[PDB]
Amino acid sequence: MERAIQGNDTREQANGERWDGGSGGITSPFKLPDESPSWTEWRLYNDETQDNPLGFKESWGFGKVVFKRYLRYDRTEASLHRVLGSWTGDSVNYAASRFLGANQVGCHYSIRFRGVSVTISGGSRTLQHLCEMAIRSKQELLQLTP
Amino acid sequence: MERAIQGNDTREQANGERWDGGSGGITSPFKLPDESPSWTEWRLYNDETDNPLGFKESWGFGKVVFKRYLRYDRTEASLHRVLGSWTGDSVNYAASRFLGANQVGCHYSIRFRGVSVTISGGSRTLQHLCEMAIRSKQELLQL
RNA sequence: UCGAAGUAUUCCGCGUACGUU
RNA sequence: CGUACGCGGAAUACUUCGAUU
């Protein structure tokens, strides 16, 4: 069965990908490692008070194989350029080719920032279009005028 | 209880507003009427060969959801028209009818050429959802 | 921020069924 | 395109619990 690309095994490994260093060798769509803060650093930051957070959460799904990232974002132009490099059409299509094939599945990209979530979703045979819409939506959300 | 601001009866009317369309007076966020094709017109169109008849969009304030299908043939005259299906005003005005002190989940969703975009978040960021939804709609309909 | 549970919706993919708007 | 399901996920909102006892 070629449906190890979808079996719960690769699913758990894709979820574990966020925290390990790719342990087991699972290919990821992201080009930068996770930066999610600790409970204590998160608790301490939240002093004044949901606005201007530490960063944003994004994820790429290929069927039920979901990868997640939390990246720091200081709302500066330099930081914007840094976090916009967390993934690219190339890195997504490369990673997607490891979990797609035969029957079409649903793919999605999701990003949350300042209490606003954007999800681009569709069939795996439209992935290139998802990427183009995903990168453009990521720019606007992170630069959304307050 | 007794909040019919987000009741099953109001969820049904908002769903019926697409077809009713104005029956009972339910305030909709859309300014244009539904243009959904019939089964046959949708068939004959696909029998012609990418470029669909139009697109689907919907606004949700909690469980109260409004839907529209609008024709869109990839022209500035058609883009400007369908961009007028709703505005920030028409959304906020409609939302204030289905929102109370408790924050609920609001969302805008649009599907075009096999791609679907959904902007969601708490009713406290509705102004920000509107700004994102309009930029997303224009971007999607324009590649 | 992380994990888990429930509740209310939506979205995508797949499959089934029924249609004159 | 519409309606009704069934399956598999995801997203959002709200709620509860745990996170070098």
From Swiss-Prot, chain B:
Q: Which GO terms describe its cellular component?
A: virion component
Q: Where is this region: Disordered?
A: 1-27
For this protein, the record's Pfam families field holds: Tombus_P19
Give the consequence of mutating W39G.
Answer: Complete loss of silencing suppression
Protein keywords: Host-virus interaction, Inhibition of host innate immune response by virus, RNA-binding, Suppressor of RNA silencing, Viral immunoevasion
Is Cytoplasm found in the keyword set?
Answer: no
For this chain, one GO molecular function annotation is: RNA binding
Which GO BP terms apply?
A: symbiont-mediated suppression of host innate immune response
Q: Which family does it belong to?
A: Belongs to the tombusvirus protein p19 family.
- State what protein this is by name: RNA silencing suppressor p19
Note the effect listed for W42G: Complete loss of silencing suppression
The protein's role, per its UniProt record: Acts as a suppressor of RNA-mediated gene silencing, also known as post-transcriptional gene silencing (PTGS), a mechanism of plant viral defense that limits the accumulation of viral RNAs. Binds to short interfering RNAs (siRNAs) with high affinity. Acts as a molecular caliper to specifically select siRNAs based on the length of the duplex region of the RNA.
SUPFAM superfamilies named among the record's database cross-references: Tombusvirus P19 core protein, VP19
Q: Which residues form a coiled coil?
A: none
The answer, when asked if Phosphoprotein is one of the entry's keywords, is no
Its ancestry begins with:
Viruses, Riboviria, Orthornavirae, Kitrinoviricota, Tolucaviricetes
Q: Subunit structure, briefly?
A: Homodimer.
